[model samples]
Target chain A: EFQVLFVLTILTLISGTIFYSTVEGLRPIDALYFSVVTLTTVGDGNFSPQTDFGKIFTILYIFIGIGLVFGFIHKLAVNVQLPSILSNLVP
Target chain B: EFQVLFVLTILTLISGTIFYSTVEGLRPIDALYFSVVTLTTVGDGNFSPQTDFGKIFTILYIFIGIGLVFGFIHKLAVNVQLPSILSNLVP
Candidate 1:
């Protein structure tokens, strides 16, 4: 279930890596930096996608990433709730 | 409770889709893309809304999306905390 989204997140993260690597001012480290910055929406404008496709891809990448993040949070909630319920039963 | 936020998130996502569609250079996919990008704050200057209404809307959308993301994460933390407590109780 959530694992599917986990994989999608990893894939999106990887694609962002590739996107930065192919563009100028975006080395491997910069790629990772840009990816995180972009996904976090804290982009400092250090590096950016130049091509039209890159631009379009960036837009898509953000939406997908945000969705995955939300899914992760939801999974976290479900995982945490059971124990609290159990504790209530015991205490 | 949680269901309410889920629906709101979906609504925001859809509004984003519509925003993109009604404008040029923003196909359905791009609408989804711009929505995600802006919401996540990963705005890359591609396909950004030109009109003042669009810009203001984009800003509002991003803030709402960010808030939703945080709420989702808090839910996850709550969910995860229970299992940890349960394990301690078992042992």
Candidate 2:
């Protein structure tokens, strides 16, 4: 389940970067960086989409991307709990 | 449980902002913005922690904060499934 979600996230990230590169006229690296940045919600304000379509896409992208990335992260965290280590420390 | 995580996230954001402001000498608004940006992974590169302490803190903060926020987001998404809507659409 997590693997599937992770793969989907990678696809989303790649698609998002491609979309940004096409619409925002950004370099592939920049677009990829922007996609990650947006998903992470860092919004450093250095780079942003100039076109209306790009802006609108960004809005929708943020909604979906955040959900996907964060959801995956959450699942991974739960699955990788340090219960044994924590228990040892506590007792 | 979700509420507790949400509250903890807020506290993390607030504490992160305060720490950045004190250590990096950022304006309150900038600090707050940076905290959100970092937590969300939007990192526009316009602002970042410059000091050694700030940098180290940011590293640790990102590790912990991302887990919390993404975990919360994932849980929320799971709880708010659209199975009913999907079933109606499909049927």
Candidate 3:
């Protein structure tokens, strides 16, 4: 259960990093950072989509990627014994 | 259980909408849109922090708010009979 989600999420992140790096002229690290920041919604505005296709890709990316990322996180929460304070909020 | 999570999430979104409207100078609908967009990790980069406090609030907001939003989603998934395709993706 955990393994499939984790693998897919990592693959998605890696693929996104590669796409942004090549298509947007971002450094690998910046692409990776943007990939994470965008998916996490911490988007600090340091980067924005420049290319038209990049913009389209980003929007679609967010819709699919965000669900996978958070779904993995939600599953991880279920598998592990989270802290007392944190788990209280969960059902 | 669902009720409490649902109520808290709504309250958080409402308060966040108010904050972005007042502090970030966004129209109420725009603020609400931003609140949803940011928490969902779309982070499309159309609007970003103009004030230091808004930036700070936004970062803190993403960490807590994203979890709550997705957690609520996960819980809602558990309660409902999701589509067959979705059940495979889910654990």
Candidate 4:
């Protein structure tokens, strides 16, 4: 069930890596790095959009992908009973 | 139950706003804008951390706050039954 979104996230990220690799002229790893960081809202800004188009694309991309990633994480956490696990571990 | 986390998320964001307000020298509203966007993983980059201190803070802040906001949204979405609702919409 959640694998559906896991795949969806994968697809979204592959496209993002390709998009930045081509549009932003980032190399493959850097493109993937940028895509992951921004989607996760790490927004490290170590490698950022240089062009207005890249910037606009980044906003749109993150808006769509954030929901996907967050939902996937929620499902994964529930699957692992991670809330209880974290509550115990963190405390 | 979730309100424990809901309030936790609120407190995190409030502290973020104040942190940015003092550290980044942003006006109140701007500090808040930065906080929300980054916390939600919107990362619009319209208002960003300028100094090294702010940049480091932004990274650490997002790491902690992203989980809080994502969990709250997941709870809120479940509360609203958005997933099943979307299931019908999608199929």
Top candidate when judged by DockQ against the true structure: 2
The global C-alpha lDDT for each of the candidates, from Candidate 1 onward, is 0.64, 0.72, 0.76, 0.74
Off by over 4 Å in 3: A1-36, A39-46, A49-91, B81-91
- Evaluated on chain A only, model 2 obtains a TM-score of 0.81
* DockQ agreement of candidate 3 with the native complex: 0.16
lDDT, model 2, position A63:
90
* DockQ ranking, best first: 2, 1, 3, 4
Residue B69 error for model 2, in Å?
A: 8.1
Residue A58 lDDT (model 1):
74
* Residues forming the 10-long window of minimal summed lDDT in candidate 2 chain A: A80-89
Candidates 1 onward: DockQ, in order: 0.20, 0.25, 0.16, 0.12
What does the lDDT come to for candidate 2?
A: 0.72
* TM-scores for all predictions: 0.51, 0.53, 0.52, 0.53
Model 3 agreement with the true structure over A31-87: per-residue lDDT tens digits:
766777777756745578889989999999999898888777676655552354356
Candidate 4 CAPRI category: incorrect
Lowest summed lDDT across 10 adjacent residues in model 2 chain B is found at: B78-87
Which wins on TM-score, candidate 1 or candidate 4? 4
Better of 2 and 4 by DockQ: 2
DockQ-better candidate, 3 vs 4: 3
What fraction of the correct interface contacts does each predicted structure contain?
0.35, 0.53, 0.26, 0.16
Tell me which residue pairs clash in candidate 4.
none
